[PDB]
Enzyme design. Structure first.
Site, PDB file in Angstrom:
ATOM      1  N   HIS A  52       0.839  -1.192   0.000  1.00  0.00           N
ATOM      2  CA  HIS A  52       0.000   0.000   0.000  1.00  0.00           C
ATOM      3  C   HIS A  52       0.872   1.239   0.000  1.00  0.00           C
ATOM      4  O   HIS A  52       1.992   1.206   0.501  1.00  0.00           O
ATOM      5  CB  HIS A  52      -0.866   0.037   1.252  1.00  0.00           C
ATOM      6  CG  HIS A  52      -2.017  -0.916   1.228  1.00  0.00           C
ATOM      7  ND1 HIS A  52      -3.252  -0.599   1.752  1.00  0.00           N
ATOM      8  CD2 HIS A  52      -2.121  -2.179   0.752  1.00  0.00           C
ATOM      9  CE1 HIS A  52      -4.067  -1.626   1.600  1.00  0.00           C
ATOM     10  NE2 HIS A  52      -3.404  -2.598   0.995  1.00  0.00           N
ATOM     11  N   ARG A  53       0.360   2.332  -0.557  1.00  0.00           N
ATOM     12  CA  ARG A  53       1.107   3.578  -0.590  1.00  0.00           C
ATOM     13  C   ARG A  53       1.237   3.988   0.863  1.00  0.00           C
ATOM     14  O   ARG A  53       0.310   3.786   1.632  1.00  0.00           O
ATOM     15  CB  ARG A  53       0.337   4.638  -1.382  1.00  0.00           C
ATOM     16  CG  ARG A  53       0.846   6.053  -1.194  1.00  0.00           C
ATOM     17  CD  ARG A  53       0.083   7.036  -2.063  1.00  0.00           C
ATOM     18  NE  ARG A  53       0.746   8.335  -2.074  1.00  0.00           N
ATOM     19  CZ  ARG A  53       0.363   9.375  -2.808  1.00  0.00           C
ATOM     20  NH1 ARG A  53      -0.691   9.275  -3.614  1.00  0.00           N
ATOM     21  NH2 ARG A  53       1.036  10.521  -2.734  1.00  0.00           N
TER      22      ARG A  53
END
Lengths: 206, 206, 206
Positions: free
Chosen positions: B82-83
């Site tokens: 995930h960012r």
């Protein structure tokens, strides 16, 4: 704009990604945040991932908003704790005369409520034990077993899971924790999604 | 002598032990060695043990030869990262206008390629995180979770996996890493299996 | 008084709780205590949970009386260890000329017997590695992986499972390990269950 937080399955033609709130709202002693989701492992609903949760023990489970929950994640409540001031053998469970040794409510060990903050990301196959608190913005690595609380915006992992590093500087975190954007009306959240995604939301609301 | 490394199921009337190169060669961004095998946990083929591998991210997975891979072993690639510069919530995933915020390649973090050397033994139900590098001749204890690099001929285990001890003295280790018997034509290896099984190949060859 | 310890399923109509002894007695190199029970996960009998146990390696597994074994618990025996004086690759398994390289028994490393004491509680999904000793009255946290011995009346957890804290002060344990109530004639225990359950047994019997 954005999905309908009341839809069991927000994505169309997709029965793997589900919204938790709709599934758990029917349950007692359980509070869930608006857009927190769970990515199904084998197509199971998240309510099947919550074990040993009996109302009688009165232990509650709280999950915040915008939480990302990976597959196989397991929440263990206080239903399976064995009385431990003496023998941990449950004689009462085998009837035939032993039923009279049924424990007393105040004799069962309860570690407290399990509370998960907002904007938390839990890796897949994570097992969360009773009486655990996980702060906002925290990241829990996959295949982790959480036994003790987790400070906000901390990155934790292991069995037993330990804090490995701080996501951001003390300062920023302090700012974010104070700002609490997940607590904004969606119209606003909806116009800053990009700033939320790049942590600049701090330099503008300050 | 020996089976044909090109045979998927090398052993007769045994659809559970399988040579991995044949199976995985049919995949983008995957390089498998010759005699490396995988002992099935329930019939599944090894390709199903590789998770979150999307060609678009271009992270590759390579495995040497003469690797013993226990059952239930799992390899996690960069496809689930995930960012993190800000919020870890996958807005883009839910469409309905949020698609807008789809992360840019240069925004998702890639830890690199996952590399498993030769003559490596990985216990059953071991989970391997993305961007990890494991040395030649290392032994990884069952049920471990590898998050960082492991040096050659090291014994490691745990969650997270830590190096526990060296298998042989630096001298010996320095030699095997030099000879790379696993790189010889099999007609040759075939007449030294005993000197390879007892580590004496160091006195003849060298 | 109490249930028949010779019954696979001592609770009428229930196929989930099962006494380990009447189940494993048929086996060889396995010793089990009278009231030790197993809380089935998906209805499977405990014998499916003991792996790589070959009578030819002659390693024995021991379990005392009054042990509470949670679901998913896995006991791994020594039939999975690979030779390791050199390559860990099992040349012999593939046959076709290589069988000649079969390892002699004194070449295969054996950690030893696995012995689980009395009045021991092992939580769900714990994996017990070969050759370990778990003392009387100990408690192993769910999702643990036992690689080494655990002293008596100690609470252990983790991967590797590590002793966390002493269940009681030494005084108590010393007497507890002395009284050995688990060895008393059942009818004597039938009259002191309450005392055993709160540890007041030390006061009287001692």
């Amino acid at each position: 704009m954005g999905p309908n937080p009341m839809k069991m399955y927000p994505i169309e033609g997709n029965k793997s990604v589900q919204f938790i709130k709709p599934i758990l709202e029917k349950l007692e002693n359980v509070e869930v945040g608006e857009y927190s989701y769970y990515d199904s492992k084998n197509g199971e609903t998240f309510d099947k991932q919550i074990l040993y949760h009996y109302p009688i023990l009165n232990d509650k489970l709280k999950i915040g908003k915008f939480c990302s929950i990976g597959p196989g994640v397991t929440i263990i409540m206080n239903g399976a704790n064995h009385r431990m001031d003496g023998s941990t053998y449950p004689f009462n469970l085998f009837g035939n005369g032993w039923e009279k040794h049924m424990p007393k409510l105040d004799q069962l060990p309860i570690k407290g409520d399990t509370i998960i903050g907002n904007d938390v990301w839990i890796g897949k196959d994570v097992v969360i034990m009773p009486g655990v608190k996980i702060g906002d913005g925290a990241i829990v690595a996959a295949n982790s077993v959480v036994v003790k609380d987790i400070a906000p915006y901390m990155l934790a992992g292991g069995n037993p899971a330990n804090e490995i590093k701080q996501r951001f500087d003390q300062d920023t975190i302090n700012q974010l924790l104070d700002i609490k954007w997940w607590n904004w009306p969606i119209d606003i959240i909806n116009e800053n999604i990009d700033k939320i995604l790049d942590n600049s939301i701090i330099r503008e609301v300050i």
